[PDB]
């Protein structure tokens, strides 16, 4: 199960039923949980923390030092949860003093060449397409779908159930449930496909749609739009999430 | 020739005059032909089928399972033909039940970081630039030139002798002999450079140009344009290929 | 310090205090200087020349043959200077007969997946973001900052102290001190942040700004603009660099 042609530092903590292929390099100050599969030529570096049930494909590199030139050798981690699919040449750098922990949650698919920068936060249930780049200290909420070659600027946040189209770039926040596409990036309606596929009622889908008509298509400023959403759209946790997300947006939201 | 620092599963079938560098990982249920060069730290996984005369550069990964979450562990292959140049960190995933075979033909250059998704089909004589992403079940016809960072949506088809400019993205078919560029992507004239370089007569080049003036610049709908091309452009296999390609286009063609 | 699980050709020349991790592959006709750190699964190929004080991250490939099909097996090199940070899966191909040497200077950061094509030239003090692609025979002057997923066409040149925004592409030269952004790419003002951060006087910053108002915003052709800059902007090495760079631009400059 553990190949003798892997290099595993004697201090690495490794759980049960872990398969490690040849030419895997595992450093000290590494924690790996149970039921993991680490394929050939993958690299698990100082500071990595890996949960249970993951598969790490060839050439992935977890835990390399930040690409941030503000990094000065401080202790930090790079972490993934459970049941993730970490594809070929995915990079997850460890954190900086700005936070200290780069964290990926559970049940994500990070397609080949995806980059997760220092102090970034990915939730659960996300799909991130080929060679998408998540810059420093970003946040991705649960259940987001991001296509390939997307550029997510530092400190941005993506809401749940968003679909971001391939090749888009953005430096504002993306509120929950929407499609974001075009250049420059833009609100492009609701992720009806994703929501239907996940079992949301047609009624809740229509409410979400109506909230975003108010927000984007009624000529109102943000405050007034959110007031009107609160007054006129049948309330539900989905609608409150839209409102709270926008109302507290650190960067502002995309157009 | 075969390095003792490679890992090669005893069941892998390997042809003659095959050079295998250190830290290459070759699985079972692999077929490799004659006269291949597999460089250091490359990965040839379960289900790979490799022809003759190829060079596989460091960090390439052939045969990993689909990135498609519809994959359920079905048997499939990832295949390349003869005389290809498979550059650094190129990924060619094996197929899904949708087809079962990811296939690359002969005499292609796949530049570093290029991704070939499950069930994709590449023909012969193609050049695909750095980190271009070919999504599920795409088709690339012979002799195409695709630049870097191109995003080719699932189920699309690219015709022969096209040049696609760097950074473009598309979700319709690209008909043969054209330049496709800009954002949003657009017909941008004929690949005169490529056609001249390959020895096409000036007369045939002019006919191709005239067919596309009819198709794109005459205000006609697709049917009427193709009717007029058939009536007015001196017929040749090139012109019939343009017509047939558009007439049977599954997605429609780009603007 | 030198891992026994590395492969190092007996002819490779390796300096003092060099750390080499497991699964590193080092060819013959390689020169490596002092105080280098080469991490796991990196590849240093025939023709590489490495200076002092660098760190080469996992999966980087230095010295592979050109991706140029005009290459016919001629001797060439791939070179880096001192104190560079060469991140995961960075590719630096060796040269062709067009020049013969791919050269990277000192004190650069090349973020993961960056490609440096045959005969390219990078100076000193540059930062090049994730998966940026530098095509054949490009030139990057000192102190440039290039974001992620940038596409730099063959034979282009980037001036010092430029900031190029993420996802941009260009096939003309970028003159010194500017921000280049949008699609299509465009002059987007001065890199005031970068210049201030590096200690340039407010007065010199204002002069640079005034030269570019003349160049881009006064309706003058290139010659007349440069004449007026020479006549009206207080002269300094910065202003002479702007003028000389544009005046001798091989491709023309971006809009
Ligand atoms: Ca790699």
Tab-separated table of C-alpha atoms in Angstrom, chain A residues 119-254:
chain	number	residue	atom	x	y	z
A	119	UNK	CA	-4.570	32.038	3.256
A	120	UNK	CA	-7.304	31.222	0.742
A	121	UNK	CA	-10.451	29.533	1.967
A	122	UNK	CA	-12.515	27.041	-0.081
A	123	UNK	CA	-15.676	25.560	1.452
A	124	UNK	CA	-17.449	22.306	0.582
A	125	UNK	CA	-18.977	20.798	-2.446
A	126	UNK	CA	-17.201	23.112	-4.968
A	127	UNK	CA	-15.954	22.349	-8.435
A	128	UNK	CA	-13.073	24.465	-9.700
A	129	UNK	CA	-12.128	24.059	-13.350
A	130	UNK	CA	-8.767	23.583	-15.069
A	131	UNK	CA	-6.000	26.028	-14.164
A	132	UNK	CA	-8.239	28.439	-12.275
A	133	UNK	CA	-6.155	30.763	-10.075
A	134	UNK	CA	-7.365	31.759	-6.617
A	135	UNK	CA	-5.263	34.592	-5.280
A	136	UNK	CA	-4.345	35.407	-1.672
A	137	UNK	CA	-6.975	35.391	1.048
A	138	UNK	CA	-9.960	34.648	-1.168
A	139	UNK	CA	-13.085	32.956	0.050
A	140	UNK	CA	-15.257	30.475	-1.834
A	141	UNK	CA	-18.583	29.540	-0.195
A	142	UNK	CA	-20.138	26.088	-0.495
A	143	UNK	CA	-21.417	24.567	-3.706
A	144	UNK	CA	-19.843	26.944	-6.206
A	145	UNK	CA	-18.995	25.919	-9.736
A	146	UNK	CA	-16.072	27.760	-11.345
A	147	UNK	CA	-15.016	26.932	-14.880
A	148	UNK	CA	-11.551	26.845	-16.351
A	149	UNK	CA	-8.994	29.602	-16.545
A	150	UNK	CA	-10.825	31.875	-14.142
A	151	UNK	CA	-8.846	34.640	-12.367
A	152	UNK	CA	-10.061	35.510	-8.922
A	153	UNK	CA	-8.365	38.538	-7.533
A	154	UNK	CA	-7.008	38.711	-3.907
A	155	UNK	CA	-9.460	39.180	-1.090
A	156	UNK	CA	-12.528	38.387	-3.268
A	157	UNK	CA	-15.413	36.209	-2.227
A	158	UNK	CA	-17.670	33.900	-4.265
A	159	UNK	CA	-21.127	32.992	-2.905
A	160	UNK	CA	-22.721	29.618	-2.934
A	161	UNK	CA	-24.266	28.054	-6.040
A	162	UNK	CA	-22.617	30.499	-8.465
A	163	UNK	CA	-21.508	29.444	-11.857
A	164	UNK	CA	-18.553	31.410	-13.191
A	165	UNK	CA	-17.942	31.030	-16.887
A	166	UNK	CA	-14.604	29.961	-18.353
A	167	UNK	CA	-11.927	32.525	-18.799
A	168	UNK	CA	-13.634	35.193	-16.712
A	169	UNK	CA	-11.783	37.431	-14.348
A	170	UNK	CA	-13.015	39.518	-11.485
A	171	UNK	CA	-11.940	41.751	-8.622
A	172	UNK	CA	-15.276	42.201	-6.821
A	173	UNK	CA	-17.427	39.772	-4.935
A	174	UNK	CA	-19.875	37.393	-6.699
A	175	UNK	CA	-23.176	37.061	-4.879
A	176	UNK	CA	-24.876	33.663	-4.378
A	177	UNK	CA	-26.893	31.697	-6.947
A	178	UNK	CA	-25.866	33.745	-10.063
A	179	UNK	CA	-24.170	33.096	-13.353
A	180	UNK	CA	-21.194	35.382	-13.880
A	181	UNK	CA	-19.838	35.682	-17.391
A	182	UNK	CA	-18.583	37.842	-20.264
A	183	UNK	CA	-15.774	40.351	-20.408
A	184	UNK	CA	-15.842	42.485	-18.399
A	185	UNK	CA	-17.552	40.028	-16.051
A	186	UNK	CA	-21.303	40.525	-15.462
A	187	UNK	CA	-24.332	39.167	-13.826
A	188	UNK	CA	-25.839	36.912	-16.510
A	189	UNK	CA	-28.961	35.606	-14.772
A	190	UNK	CA	-29.524	32.785	-12.267
A	191	UNK	CA	-27.867	29.371	-12.077
A	192	UNK	CA	-31.267	27.733	-12.798
A	193	UNK	CA	-29.605	24.533	-14.046
A	194	UNK	CA	-27.570	24.066	-10.919
A	195	UNK	CA	-30.446	24.953	-8.623
A	196	UNK	CA	-32.936	22.646	-10.341
A	197	UNK	CA	-30.378	19.853	-10.413
A	198	UNK	CA	-29.972	20.242	-6.687
A	199	UNK	CA	-33.721	20.097	-5.917
A	200	UNK	CA	-34.569	23.714	-5.122
A	201	UNK	CA	-38.266	24.394	-5.611
A	202	UNK	CA	-39.401	26.360	-8.640
A	203	UNK	CA	-40.909	28.787	-6.253
A	204	UNK	CA	-37.628	29.440	-4.387
A	205	UNK	CA	-35.878	29.705	-7.775
A	206	UNK	CA	-38.376	32.336	-8.878
A	207	UNK	CA	-37.822	34.279	-5.623
A	208	UNK	CA	-34.071	34.264	-6.145
A	209	UNK	CA	-34.665	35.474	-9.680
A	210	UNK	CA	-36.882	38.269	-8.455
A	211	UNK	CA	-34.376	39.373	-5.843
A	212	UNK	CA	-31.732	39.730	-8.576
A	213	UNK	CA	-34.089	41.618	-10.882
A	214	UNK	CA	-34.462	44.060	-8.072
A	215	UNK	CA	-30.740	44.157	-7.385
A	216	UNK	CA	-29.380	44.388	-10.905
A	217	UNK	CA	-32.262	45.461	-13.203
A	218	UNK	CA	-34.355	48.036	-11.341
A	219	UNK	CA	-32.024	51.022	-11.316
A	220	UNK	CA	-31.712	51.028	-7.559
A	221	UNK	CA	-28.594	51.607	-5.544
A	222	UNK	CA	-27.508	48.740	-3.291
A	223	UNK	CA	-29.183	49.913	-0.132
A	224	UNK	CA	-32.495	50.618	-1.724
A	225	UNK	CA	-32.434	47.399	-3.639
A	226	UNK	CA	-31.803	45.363	-0.524
A	227	UNK	CA	-34.574	47.233	1.286
A	228	UNK	CA	-36.959	46.379	-1.489
A	229	UNK	CA	-35.867	42.725	-1.611
A	230	UNK	CA	-36.519	42.497	2.128
A	231	UNK	CA	-39.967	44.119	1.676
A	232	UNK	CA	-41.182	42.400	-1.452
A	233	UNK	CA	-39.565	38.970	-1.952
A	234	UNK	CA	-40.989	36.116	0.106
A	235	UNK	CA	-38.423	35.583	2.777
A	236	UNK	CA	-36.373	32.379	3.022
A	237	UNK	CA	-32.823	31.451	4.041
A	238	UNK	CA	-31.791	31.798	0.359
A	239	UNK	CA	-33.050	35.377	0.196
A	240	UNK	CA	-31.463	36.267	3.482
A	241	UNK	CA	-28.191	34.887	2.267
A	242	UNK	CA	-28.356	37.061	-0.881
A	243	UNK	CA	-29.079	40.141	1.226
A	244	UNK	CA	-26.521	39.529	3.931
A	245	UNK	CA	-23.831	38.619	1.412
A	246	UNK	CA	-24.287	41.877	-0.553
A	247	UNK	CA	-24.925	44.078	2.436
A	248	UNK	CA	-21.658	43.018	4.087
A	249	UNK	CA	-19.610	42.642	0.892
A	250	UNK	CA	-16.083	43.751	1.488
A	251	UNK	CA	-15.222	44.560	-2.082
A	252	UNK	CA	-18.589	45.435	-3.512
A	253	UNK	CA	-20.258	43.079	-5.983
A	254	UNK	CA	-19.713	42.591	-9.669
